[PDB]
Structures are given as C-alpha cells and as structure tokens.
Amino acid sequence: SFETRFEKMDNLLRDPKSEVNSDCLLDGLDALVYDLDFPALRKNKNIDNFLSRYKDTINKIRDLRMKAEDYEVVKVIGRGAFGEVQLVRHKSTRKVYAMKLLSKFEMIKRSFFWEERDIMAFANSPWVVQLFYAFQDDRYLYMVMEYMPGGDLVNLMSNYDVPEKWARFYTAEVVLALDAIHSMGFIHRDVKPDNMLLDKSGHLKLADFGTCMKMNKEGMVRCDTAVGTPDYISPEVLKSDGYYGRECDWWSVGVFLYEMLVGDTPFYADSLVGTYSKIMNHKNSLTFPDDNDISKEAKNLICAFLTDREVRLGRNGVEEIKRHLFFKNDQWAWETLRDTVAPVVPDLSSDIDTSNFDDLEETFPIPKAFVGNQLPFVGFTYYSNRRY
Amino acid sequence: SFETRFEKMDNLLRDPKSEVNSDCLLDGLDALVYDLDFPALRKNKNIDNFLSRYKDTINKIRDLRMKAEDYEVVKVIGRGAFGEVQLVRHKSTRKVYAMKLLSKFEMIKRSFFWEERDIMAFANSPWVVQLFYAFQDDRYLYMVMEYMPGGDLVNLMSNYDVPEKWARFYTAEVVLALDAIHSMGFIHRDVKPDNMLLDKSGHLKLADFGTCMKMNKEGMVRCDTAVGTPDYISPEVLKSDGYYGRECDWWSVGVFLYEMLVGDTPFYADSLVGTYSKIMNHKNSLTFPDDNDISKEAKNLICAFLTDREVRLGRNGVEEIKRHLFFKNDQWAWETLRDTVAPVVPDLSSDIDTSNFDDLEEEEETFPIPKAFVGNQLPFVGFTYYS
Numbered sequence: 001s002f003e004t005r006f007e008k009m010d011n012l013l014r015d016p017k018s019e020v021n022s023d024c025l026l027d028g029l030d031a032l033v034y035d036l037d038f039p040a041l042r043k044n045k046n047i048d049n050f051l052s053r054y055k056d057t058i059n060k061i062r063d064l065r066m067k068a069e070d071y072e073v074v075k076v077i078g079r080g081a082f083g084e085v086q087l088v089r090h091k092s093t094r095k096v097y098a099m100k101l102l103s104k105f106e107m108i109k110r111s112f113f114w115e116e117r118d119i120m121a122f123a124n125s126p127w128v129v130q131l132f133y134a135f136q137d138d139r140y141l142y143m144v145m146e147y148m149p150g151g152d153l154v155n156l157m158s159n160y161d162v163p164e165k166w167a168r169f170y171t172a173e174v175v176l177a178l179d180a181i182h183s184m185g186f187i188h189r190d191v192k193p194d195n196m197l198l199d200k201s202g203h204l205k206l207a208d209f210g211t212c213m214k215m216n217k218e219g220m221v222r223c224d225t226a227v228g229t230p231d232y233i234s235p236e237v238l239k240s241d242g243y244y245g246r247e248c249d250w251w252s253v254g255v256f257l258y259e260m261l262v263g264d265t266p267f268y269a270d271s272l273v274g275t276y277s278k279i280m281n282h283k284n285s286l287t288f289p290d291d292n293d294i295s296k297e298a299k300n301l302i303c304a305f306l307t308d309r310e311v312r313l314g315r316n317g318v319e320e321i322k323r324h325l326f327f328k329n330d331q332w333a334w335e336t337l338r339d340t341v342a343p344v345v346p347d348l349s350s351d352i353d354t355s356n357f358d359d360l361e362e363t364f365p366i367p368k369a370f371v372g373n374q375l376p377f378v379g380f381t382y383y384s385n386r387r388y
Numbered sequence: 389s390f391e392t393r394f395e396k397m398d399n400l401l402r403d404p405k406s407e408v409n410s411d412c413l414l415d416g417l418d419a420l421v422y423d424l425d426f427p428a429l430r431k432n433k434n435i436d437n438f439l440s441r442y443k444d445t446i447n448k449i450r451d452l453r454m455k456a457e458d459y460e461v462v463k464v465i466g467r468g469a470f471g472e473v474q475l476v477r478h479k480s481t482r483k484v485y486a487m488k489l490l491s492k493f494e495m496i497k498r499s500f501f502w503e504e505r506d507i508m509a510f511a512n513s514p515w516v517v518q519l520f521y522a523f524q525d526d527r528y529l530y531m532v533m534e535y536m537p538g539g540d541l542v543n544l545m546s547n548y549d550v551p552e553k554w555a556r557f558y559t560a561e562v563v564l565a566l567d568a569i570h571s572m573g574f575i576h577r578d579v580k581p582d583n584m585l586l587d588k589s590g591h592l593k594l595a596d597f598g599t600c601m602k603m604n605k606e607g608m609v610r611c612d613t614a615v616g617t618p619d620y621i622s623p624e625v626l627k628s629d630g631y632y633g634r635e636c637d638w639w640s641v642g643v644f645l646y647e648m649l650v651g652d653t654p655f656y657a658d659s660l661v662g663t664y665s666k667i668m669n670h671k672n673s674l675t676f677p678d679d680n681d682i683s684k685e686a687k688n689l690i691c692a693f694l695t696d697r698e699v700r701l702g703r704n705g706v707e708e709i710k711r712h713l714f715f716k717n718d719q720w721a722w723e724t725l726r727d728t729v730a731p732v733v734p735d736l737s738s739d740i741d742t743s744n745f746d747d748l749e750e751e752e753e754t755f756p757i758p759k760a761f762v763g764n765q766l767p768f769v770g771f772t773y774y775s
C-alpha cells in the first residue's frame with residue numbers, strides 16, 4: 001500500500017535502534033564527504049562535482065551537529081592505546097559529563113565500540129553508566145556518558161582499609177551489575193575496580209564495555225585472544241583455542257573481594273609473566289594473611305570464585321552466588337540493595353566537583369584512491385532525548 | 389544554543405527544498421551502495437563489511453521507496469537522446485501520469501535535470517506542468533508529471549486550420565505561462581508547440597524545462613551553446629560568445645503565432661543548415677503569403693516579435709505584449725483568461741483516455757563494471773522528490 005510505505009519509511013527514520021535513521025543517514029553523507037575530499041580523488045569529475053555541490057551544505061550540517069569543540073576538557077581521567085577518557089563540560093550548558101574518545105586510525109589497525117555504544121545507550125539499568133551522546137569526526141569516535149561524582153573503587157580502596165560490611169556491599173552490587181550485563185547476553189571480560197564507578201548516592205555502576213562479547217545459544221564465547229587486566233584475568237581467558245562463558249566475570253569478582261579485604265591483588269607480580277604464572281597455579285599461590293581481619297565466609301567466597309571454571313561458584317547461575325553465607329547480613333537485601341544507604345556517601349562541594357578523580361593532563365595516510373576509512377563508523381552517531 | 393541545533397537539523401531533514409532532507413540522504417546511501425557493490429572494490433575490508441552490514445536495510449529501503457516497477461507503460465509518447473517520455477499508470481492507484489525517463493549512462497557521456505525538476509516541483513502555477521514524483525535507480529532518473537489529456541499544440545495544428553481567434557487564446561496563454569517562468573528567474577529557451585500541452589478543459593501548460601537557465605542580477609544568461617529547436621531558435625541563441633535575456637522566449641512566441649496562422653514555420657528549410665541560415669537573415673526572409681485571412685494586428689505582432697532583441701516587443705516587460713491590439717477581444721481579460729472556455733474542449737471518453745497522443749514503439753548500453761570507485765551515482769544524489 002502507498003502511504004503504508006511512506007509510514008514504514010518514516011518509522012525507519014524515527015527509530016533510535018534503526019540503522020537508517022536520520023542520524024545514521026547524516027553519518028553516511030559525512031563519511032562519504034571525508035572519504036572523497038582528497039586531491040587525487042578530485043581528479044574524478046563525478047567526485048569533484050559532488051563535493052563542490054555539497055560543500056556549503058556539509059559545512060552547515062557539520063556546524064549544527066554535535067562536535068568536539070562543543071565540549072571543554074575539565075580533567076583527563078583515563079588513557080588507552082585506543083584513546084582517552086576525560087571529564088568534559090558542555091560549553092553552553094556548563095554540565096559535567098565523562099567523554100570517552102576512540103581513535104579511528106587505531107580502530108581500523110588491529111581492533112567493539114558497537115556493543116559499548118549499545119550497552120550504555122539502551123541498557124536502561126541502574127547498574128550501567130548511561131550514554132547521553134555518541135558522535136564523531138574524521139579522527140575520533142566520542143562517547144558522552146553520565147558523570148559519576150563518587151569516583152572509582154581504586155580511589156576508595158586507596159583511602160580506606162575497606163571493612164567487611166563495605167566489601168559485602170560493593171561485591172553484592174557488582175554481582176547485580178554483572179547479572180544485568182549477562183541478562184543482556186554479554187560477558188564483560190574486564191571486570192575490575194577501575195571500571196566500577198560511584199554515583200552521587202555512593203551506589204555502583206559498571207563502566208568500560210570495550211571488551212564485551214555477545215554469548216551464543218550455549219551462553220559461550222569463541223575467542224583466541226587474551227582480554228582484560230593482568231591481575232583480574234581468569235585462567236581460561238589466559239589459556240585462550242578458547243571457548244568460555246560468563247564464569248570469567250565471576251573469577252574477577254573474587255579478585256576484587258580479595259583486593260578490598262587484603263589490600264593487594266591475589267596474583268600480583270613484578271611482571272606480566274609471574275602474574276600469569278600465579279593465576280595458572282592459583283591452587284598453591286592463593287594465600288590469605290595470618291590474621292583475624294578476614295572472616296571464614298569471606299575466605300570461602302574468594303576460594304569458591306578463585307578456582308577452575310567447572311568447579312567455580314556461578315556455573316549454575318547467580319542464585320548460588322546470591323545464596324552464599326558471606327552475603328547473610330542484617331543491613332541489606334538483594335531486591336532492595338540499590339535503595340539502601342551506601343557505605344560511603346560522596347561529600348561533594350557541588351554537582352560539578354571533580355575532586356574524587358586524579359587529573360592526568362597521528363591519523364590515516366592520504367589516499368591515492370577511494371579506501372572508505374569512515375565506512376566502519378557510519379551509524380555510530382546517537383543522541384539522547386533526556387532533558388535537564 | 390543546544391535544542392536550537394537539533395530543531396534546525398530537524399527542519400533541514402523535513403524541508404523539500406533542502407539539499408540534506410531525508411530523501412537526499414536516502415539517495416546518498418543508495419548511490420554509495422550501487423557504486424561500491426562490485427567484486428574488485430569488495431576486496432577492500434571497509435567497503436566489504438559496510439555492504440554486508442547494510443545488505444538487509446538497503447533491500448528494505450529499495451522495496452519501500454518508489455520504483456519503476458510501481459508504474460505500467462500505457463503508451464510511449466516521446467523519444468530523446470537522453471531517454472523516453474511515456475504515459476504510465478500507477479499499478480495500485482490506476483491513475484494515469486506522464487513519465488520522463490533520463491538515462492544516467494547517456495548523461496555521463498557529456499551532460500539540467502535540476503532546474504527541470506525544480507520548476508515542475510515548486511512552480512505552483514496553473515501554467516507549468518506539475519511534477520508529482522521524482523525517483524531513480526542505478527540506470528534511470530524518473531519524473532512522474534501530471535497527465536494532460538488534450539495533447540499538444542502540434543497535434544492541434546495538424547487537425548485544424550487555426551482561426552485567428554484560437555491563435556489569440558493560445559498566444560495569450562503562452563505569454564502568461566512564459567511570464568510565470570520569467571518571474572521564477574528562468575528563460576525557457578525551447579518555446580515550441582511540442583512543449584505546450586492541453587489539460588481536460590483545453591487550457592495550456594508549458595512543459596519540458598530541460599533547457600531552462602537561471603537569470604543573473606541583470607536578468608541575463610551566459611551561454612556559448614545553441615539551445616532549442618532549429619525552427620524556433622532566436623538569432624541571439626544562434627549567434628552563441630552569448631549574453632542574452634528573456635527576449636529569446638518572445639521571439640519563439642512570434643514563430644508560434646506565425647505557424648498557427650500560416651500553417652508553416654517562418655524560416656523553414658529541408659535541413660538544419662537551410663533553416664539556421666533563414667533565421668540569421670530574418671530581416672529579408674520573413675514574408676506572409678497572399679491572403680485576406682491574416683489581420684493587420686496579427687502580422688504586426690509577429691513582426692514586433694520577429695526582430696533583433698534591442699527592438700523586440702517584451703524588452704520593456706510583459707505589459708507591452710499584453711497591451712498589443714492583437715489581444716483586444718470581448719470574451720476574455722488577461723486576469724480572467726484561464727477561467728474562460730477554451731476554443732477546443734477535449735472530447736475524452738474517460739480521465740484515462742490517451743487518444744490525443746500518438747503511440748511510438750520501445751537492449752541498452754550501460755556503465756562498465758568498475759575496477760575502482762568511479763562514483764557514477766554521485767551526480768544524481770538529491771534528485772528524489774515526493775509531493
């Protein structure tokens with residue numbers, strides 16, 4: 001039917017989850033222009049004329065659509081080979097956000113941002129950091145996320161000899177947060193206290209969805225490359241032929257609980273190897289201090305997590321973790337946990353206070369022919385309907 | 389301002405006159421897919437992955453959006469070097485339209501459709517044929533125009549000995565239609581009876597805006613190439629260095645009036661040379677054959693039009709043409725003309741009757757398979773239009 005077709009098309013342009021929505025289509029034009037505007041390609045009349053025709057229109061669109069110049073760097077909080085994570089401020093609104101930058105040159109040359117963009121944009125979970133905006137240019141991919149003023153658990157652990165009650169609270173919240181990721185069909189693969197952020201209320205939210213892999217019908221993943229941080233990496237991810245499930249995320253929870261209660265990671269070494277050697281021989285290298293500061297149940301939970309896959313707590317689902325004695329407390333309940341009073345409530349001067357975060361501080365060659373470097377990134381643009 | 393930018397962007401996507409509206413953006417993706425889907429280019433990972441990613445959505449869009457397969461050829465009515473012109477019927481609605489097809493291939497071998505598309509789409513004039521839809525594929529540009537069941541003036545002239553009273557009606561209507569085009573900032577450059585179509589009521593509409601050129605601040609045009617039909621071409625367009633105005637359109641009106649009243653074009657010959665030579669020498673070649681038929685005022689109007697541009701009627705605007713004695717008549721006023729009863733009212737069986745149009749007949753040369761990106765669809769991005 002005639003107008004049915006226009007309506008179906010209009011919904012194709014409407015849909016934020018659609019690959020052909022207005023922003024995905026603007027991505028295409030923008031990519032095409034960047035991918036064609038080179039002197040060698042402009043020798044082609046078709047390319048030259050098209051670029052001349054669209055010059056004014058593309059400059060207008062580029063100005064109107066969200067750009068790097070709309071934000072001001074307040075503080076640099078993270079750094080990777082792929083890019084930086086920084087605390088920014090929208091120049092007009094003065095609102096503080098977290099911005100993750102990914103180098104397009106680094107994406108193409110030895111590669112994930114799709115799932116990272118999707119989890120943060122459409123998770124609608126109190127456990128996952130919300131993504132407000134996703135935009136780009138010929139050099140970077142940008143992810144404007146909700147600001148978490150309480151900082152990370154690394155900062156918390158560096159200020160306190162974490163009492164058990166707090167360790168129980170943060171472990172329980174990570175279990176819930178990980179169970180949320182798992183229900184979406186993903187294994188985090190990089191669970192660590194640097195990726196656990198605290199909101200204004202002091203409750204946890206997960207970050208870094210950059211290693212998230214979608215599980216299969218058997219809830220497994222085929223990966224032959226090591227992923228994650230040396231201290232938190234499970235033996236199975238280290239040994240990766242590789243066919244593993246969501247249990248690698250539970251191994252990291254046991255590393256996290258040990259770290260909070262002991263003050264050090266269980267398999268710490270002077271090198272990348274030796275760390276990896278200790279993880280392999282966790283059976284004889286996992287030891288606790290000879291003192292009464294860590295309870296029987298805490299030690300058992302760590303050990304129930306720090307074992308081989310097939311015997312690890314969480315191989316029969318969350319309920320077996322939720323039911324562990326370590327979680328028995330007269331302070332919270334699993335279904336009421338994010339509504340309880342957090343152990344550490346951030347005492348922030350203002351909504352723009354960045355105190356809880358420590359301040360830190362080449363692209364593509366010119367083509368001689370069409371190579372289409374912007375094509376892997378068409379559709380990355382995303383804008384939230386959320387107002388303030 | 390933040391919200392402002394999204395609204396401004398939201399207007400740009402909506403605007404039918406915008407270069408970045410939803411349909412031009414769909415045109416871009418479609419173009420890009422056609423120009424990249426070749427085995428040689430698919431050796432490029434970026435191109436290969438992109439095409440794989442967009443396979444399903446491109447097939448959906450292609451199916452949903454208007455296509456050639458939505459229309460059925462009723463009759464072939466025209467044939468140019470750049471494509472055909474045919475009377476079509478939308479398969480679902482059963483409504484008859486006129487469709488102009490332009491071969492994107494042929495066009496690439498030395499290239500105008502922009503102004504033709506724009507005049508017919510945005511003219512909103514009872515004198516200009518309305519373009520309902522403009523769409524395309526990897527091979528053709530399509531223009532779905534309103535159907536004019538009375539046929540053209542060539543057909544009319546071939547069936548009747550045009551009395552001076554009818555000649556006045558059709559001349560007056562062309563004057564109004566041309567004045568409408570000039571007010572939009574264009575010179576038609578191809579005024580001829582073949583491009584004058586009649587509606588159900590017997591009223592004229594100008595068609596084929598394939599030679600239309602936009603005037604400058606001085607109401608002039610820089611063109612060094614001859615444009616139009618040999619018989620109707622003005623001396624100034626023929627002499628083209630070339631810097632001319634809207635007066636070339638008025639020369640053609642004088643050819644049209646002469647043709648209707650005389651039964652032959654004033655500078656006719658058995659070649660494209662014999663005719664071109666007869667135009668350059670209009671001062672001695674213009675003659676009226678022996679009769680009591682053609683009135684004093686009719687001859688004066690023809691001559692006031694068939695002169696050099698600096699002495700031609702219409703160099704001081706339409707009012708001097710409108711005021712000519714030839715137009716003095718009791719039946720109509722310039723302001724009441726398209727509301728009057730036409731001299732010939734088409735006697736059509738139905739709204740789908742195509743009898744005033746002669747049917748013509750109906751394996752194409754197409755773009756070679758690229759070994760590298762060539763971007764053949766790029767000249768046509770933005771052509772899609774839906775009213």
Ligand SMILES: CC(C)(N)CNc1nc(-c2ccc3[nH]ncc3c2)nc2cnccc12
Pocket residue numbers: 077078079085097098100129145146147148149151152194195197207208209210
């Ligand atoms: C000190 C840190 C927390 N380790 C910095 N590293 C990263 N932080 C964040 C992030 C997300 C949302 C946020 N809201 N407020 C702050 C904030 C920070 N995302 C990342 C994603 N991939 C890698 C590293 C990071």
Ligand SMILES: CC(C)(N)CNc1nc(-c2ccc3[nH]ncc3c2)nc2cnccc12
Pocket residue numbers: 465466468473485486488517533534535536537540582583585595596597598
């Ligand atoms: C014998 C004819 C009618 N002159 C055929 N030649 C052309 N016809 C038309 C056209 C437009 C709208 C119409 N509506 N109803 C009929 C109809 C015909 N457009 C053109 C555009 N460029 C060149 C030639 C033509």
